[PDB]
Amino acid sequence: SSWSRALVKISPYTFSAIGIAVAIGVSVLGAAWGIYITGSSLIGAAIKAPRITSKNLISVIFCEAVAIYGVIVAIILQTKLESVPASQIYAPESLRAGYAIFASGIIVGFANLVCGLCVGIIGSSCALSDAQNSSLFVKILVIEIFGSALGLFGVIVGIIMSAQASWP
Amino acid sequence: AMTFNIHGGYLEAIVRGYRAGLLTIVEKCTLKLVDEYKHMLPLSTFLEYITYGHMIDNVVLIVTGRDVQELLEKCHPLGMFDSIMRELYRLVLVDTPLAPYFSECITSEDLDDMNIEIMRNTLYKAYLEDFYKFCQKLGGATAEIMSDLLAFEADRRAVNITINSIGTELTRDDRRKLYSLYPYGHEELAVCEDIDQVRGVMEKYPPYQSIFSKLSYGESQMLDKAFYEEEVKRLCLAFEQQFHYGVFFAYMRLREQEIRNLMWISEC
Amino acid sequence: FLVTTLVFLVIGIIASLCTRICCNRGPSTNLLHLTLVITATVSCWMMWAIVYLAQMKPLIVPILSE
Amino acid sequence: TYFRTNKFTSAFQEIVDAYGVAKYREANPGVFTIVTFPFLFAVMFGDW
Amino acid sequence: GLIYNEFFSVPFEIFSHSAYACRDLSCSEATTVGLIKVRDTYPFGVDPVWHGSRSELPFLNSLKMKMSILLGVAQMNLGIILSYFNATFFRIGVNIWCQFIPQIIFLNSLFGYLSLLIILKWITGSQADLYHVMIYMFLSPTDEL
Amino acid sequence: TAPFFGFLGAAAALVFSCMGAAYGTAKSGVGVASMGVMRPELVMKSIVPVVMAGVLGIYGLIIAVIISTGINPKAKSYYLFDGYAHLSSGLACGLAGLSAGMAIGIVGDAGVRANAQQPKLFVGMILILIFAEALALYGLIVGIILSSRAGQ
Amino acid sequence: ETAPFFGFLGAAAALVFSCMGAAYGTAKSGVGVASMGVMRPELVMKSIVPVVMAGVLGIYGLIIAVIISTGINPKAKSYYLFDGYAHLSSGLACGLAGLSAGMAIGIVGDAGVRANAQQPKLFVGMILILIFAEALALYGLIVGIILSSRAGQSR
Amino acid sequence: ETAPFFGFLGAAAALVFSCMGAAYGTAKSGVGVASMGVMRPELVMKSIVPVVMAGVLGIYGLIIAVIISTGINPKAKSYYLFDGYAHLSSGLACGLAGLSAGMAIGIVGDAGVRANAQQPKLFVGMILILIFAEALALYGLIVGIILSSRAGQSR
Amino acid sequence: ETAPFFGFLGAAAALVFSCMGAAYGTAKSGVGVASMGVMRPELVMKSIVPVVMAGVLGIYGLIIAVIISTGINPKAKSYYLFDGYAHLSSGLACGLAGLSAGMAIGIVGDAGVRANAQQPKLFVGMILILIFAEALALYGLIVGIILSSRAGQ
Amino acid sequence: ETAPFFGFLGAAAALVFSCMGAAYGTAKSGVGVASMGVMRPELVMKSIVPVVMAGVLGIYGLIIAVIISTGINPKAKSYYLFDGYAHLSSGLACGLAGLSAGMAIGIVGDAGVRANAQQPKLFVGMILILIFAEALALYGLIVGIILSSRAGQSR
């Protein structure tokens, strides 16, 4: 009861800000991990032969697209912020807006992380495959592009959830 | 899964590229492969075990003397590294995985390592110790390949023992006591004194079934060639080399097989 | 109940007569057959006795679901 | 030794003998179990 | 299955018409003090009403447990009795009287109290015992009470 | 007040679904590259299993969309039952998608190797993978049914 | 009251655990089937039975989830805490049983498929093992159905 | 009020843990049988004993769960916390015993299936060991029955 | 009021832990027995001594559980917390002792199977070790009974 | 008030820890003696000393626990939380000391079995090590007895 009351009495603005920051942080972390995964294979292939640098750069660009989408989502969330008035600090509208912001941020961050990991693994495999044979680069690039859609879907879901903000 | 990208990715890519590029000429190719392997310097332990594989044979050869100075001519860095006669054996007991065990198992020195047959027995014991050490480093799909190689060596030794080395005290008990499913079911080969008996013993493993076939070739050779030739023939399985896995040993084995094929080519 | 108890016993006697008529070809064979018939009759009668003693005077009455 | 097996009793005798054998004329639990096993396996699946 | 009065997961017409009849309850619910009054016991099988009733589980469970206990007692008694016949047929030593008699007597007596209690509860209708208080009586190792 | 759980359900449904979708797509993709090293033609057709794994993300995305649309606070009073139901509906869809994708990734990775070895068994691998992928569809059905219980 | 917050959670958990078990079974079954069919493509069709046997657990879990969902209706009757608790218990039991059965079926099927080409008797042995495993899933489904039905009274 | 939650949770836990133990035992036995039967057809049927020996534990657990579920009857008696605590304890004991028996039976059955290719004189010993292990399931069922019987006598 | 919620839990935990220890011992015992019987079928029957002795722990656990269940008699006396807590502690102690004894017996039997297979002359030593191990289980059962006997406040 | 909870918990913890330590020591001793039972059965008979020492340590722990339990007589004198806390601490200390001594003695015996098998002249050293190890258990028992005696000084 008293513990439950204290839990229900937590400030929603703090949770909303935490989710907003966490979305960008997780997107950046996932993009960096995918970039490193792709870069290891790209550097190995270049050491083997520098002929496929242009083909390899596509994986890096795709990985950075996740970071770009995360940054856009973070900017949108920052735009979604309000003044947080003292009177409505515990109003139902404020609590709903904070919960929606936190949920959208968590969803965006998790989707960005998953998409970044998948893209990094796909690019790491694809660079080695291209080093084995340049004829298979087209199919590998198509597969990577198809797998990159996870981040776009997560961003779409986060944008849809962002409309729920109604902080007075 | 992410550990491969965390570390070892560049080395794995370089090894894959070198293997894909692969296909006194034999000596030159062996020297080039050894240089490529050395220039590559977690995976450090795997490389050490892979080198120790041939280093066991190199140390066994160096254990002679008896024209011992000729061992410098075959100082291939791939297997004949300097870092890898009981007084000298104790000194050589360091920097090798199988050496500490062979110090006690082969404490008789030349008495248990006579160049006629007992030297081969000591080499087989060292190979068994090295195979056990390699199998200890479990965690990857290479455990199956290592087990297959050890089984092939043990079965070839057992076949050689039953063929003619039985008169050299390589009896049924010696088929596993000195001659290096095999780690659990090698007892079936203790009574395979005939080629038909060898085929019947191989029938206990359906994958090993029909591998012996007429046994005119492969099984015809003594020492470790009988079932090792079966592994050489089936090495097309090793040619798969699925990605994101330890393939350094596979690349080394492929390079060794290519060198052996080039040597067997010789003057056409 | 007790009337049915004799009914099971009487059923075995007719079965006993049939078994004797059939297995009279073998005396030791007939002896084995009689054991099987007696065992079957006893088992069936015991099962029926359990089923009847359970519901003879129930301690708990049956309530029906809706 | 083995007790003589009839045409119908052979299957039950073989099923029971999977635990072992006895002396030339020792105890043969197959005689009772030829009907006991049907007399007990019926209960676990009683549904007419 | 004929004994169990269940045919293809469904009851049917027993040799009698209806073992238990709802005591009054022309419109009253089954769950009542009157409950169901039994005119007579159905001899062919279990009461048809009991199978589909809410109280099907407890009564059937108690009956099945009692039947299993009795059948196990009978099978153990037959197996123990076969020992004397085997000893006589093979002309075994005095070990039968030395060991087979106590072996067949100890377990028989130990299960005899439970079997006799089950029979008496079934026979005398001692509802003050039911499935549970029988074990309760068997539970106490000490005297008195 | 309770609507925090309901909002969290939609986010969890997409997050957990994509978590399994990426894992399935990664394992399927890795095998495809391995087959593409030698078998040029087989790899192009084998991409279907990767495409099948990517579909699970779409199924989770649609489920998330429905949950978001049903959390309109100003439209109807979102009582605790609606929030509890939406969170429960999302939890099943997200968890099922994660498991369904994981099996597809494990099956698909072996399937690429199997097809590269013997092309005849390609039909068999597709049949097993298609049967496994039905679990995600099964999770989608449960999600719709649970979400439909938001009447009161 | 707060009873739906537990009842719906249990209903969702049933389907979640059933799907997890089905996926765990299907992964091993597919791996074994691929390993067997690499060398003997003829027996690939016969080796697919354990896959469907494992997948049947998903259908069982879906049926249990549908029953649990239909069992809650505030517009019909006041779902007291007892009803929600019993529904959650039934869901959890069914889901855990399904997950365990799926894992066991997957392990057994993978082993049998690996041993399928060694001897044709595996075609019967693995089928028998899969049936014996699915018996546990059927028993769990029956127990869950019984618990869900008993959840309807709530005094 | 909250006691029926505890009772239903105990019954569900009993069923789930018994199912998990039976599944583990069945998976171990299936792996052993798949390994053994490749060489000889004897393991196809002559060694399928543990396959049903492990499912016997699951059947016992299902029976105990059904008994526990039938134990609760709010319309007949307003259960206090005593009934819920007793039901939960009985369910936990039954489930834990079932899991332990399942694990032990699975290990023993895998060992016996492996040894099947050895001298067949060990079949009697393996069966005896399996029966001795399965005695734990009967002991757990007896303990659960005693607890359920003592459960309803709350004041 | 909350005493039964502890006493019944203690009894169930005692039974569960005793069963777990018995199973843990019996797994190793059966593995060793199967190995010895494969190696030497002659002594397979006589090697089931640890396997048979494993069930003694389960029997003792069942007895302790029955005693604990008989301890809870609300009609006989209002169960205060002083009795329920004592019963729960006695059950926990008995279960832990049973689990420890089962693990020890499993290790001892696993060693002794190979020891007898190499040479049956160590059967006496194996039996003595098993008896010494089971002494711990006996002491635990006695302690549990003594603790349960103090339910009179 | 709630002191009997603390006292019973302390006694149970003492018994459990002592049993666990004795079990670990006995298992280590048996593992060590397994080799001596074949290498030199003549010396194997004298090799049972560490098992006896472990049993003695377990007996001492059980005796301390029994004394602690016998010290709780609520009807004779009300048990304040001070006495319960003191008894629980005494039991915990005795159990921990017994477990540590048992583990140490087990390791020592496991080493000493091979040590004596290699050379019979190491029996004196093994006996000295075992006595030194048992001294720790004796000290722990003495400390537990002192604490149990002091537990009744409250008012």
Next chain:
Amino acid sequence: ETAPFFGFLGAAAALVFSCMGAAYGTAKSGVGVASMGVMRPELVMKSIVPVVMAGVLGIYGLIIAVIISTGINPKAKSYYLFDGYAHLSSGLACGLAGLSAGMAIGIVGDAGVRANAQQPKLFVGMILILIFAEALALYGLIVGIILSSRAGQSR
């Protein structure tokens, strides 16, 4: 107040930790000494010095426990929360110091057994490490005694 709820617990924990550390050190030293005696029975008697030196931890722990137990006496004077907290802190410090000293002495003795077996010249010299460990244990005991001396400082 609730002073013995912490003071007596700390007094027990001091002896518990000291016994655990002494047991670990003695076990390591005994394993080393057994190996050395197997190598050479002549050095077995002379190499028991580290084993005996490791026993000082038990004596120090017993003395600290006795002092702490004597320091609690409500009949003589009521002890506040501070009076028990200080004793608990002293006991914890003494126990942790004893455990650390025991571990260090065990490692040092395990090394020194082989060191003496190889080179008898360094055998006597190696005792410096054991002397340093004993000095560390004595310093810890002195610190604990100083902390415990403040029992009567409260008011």
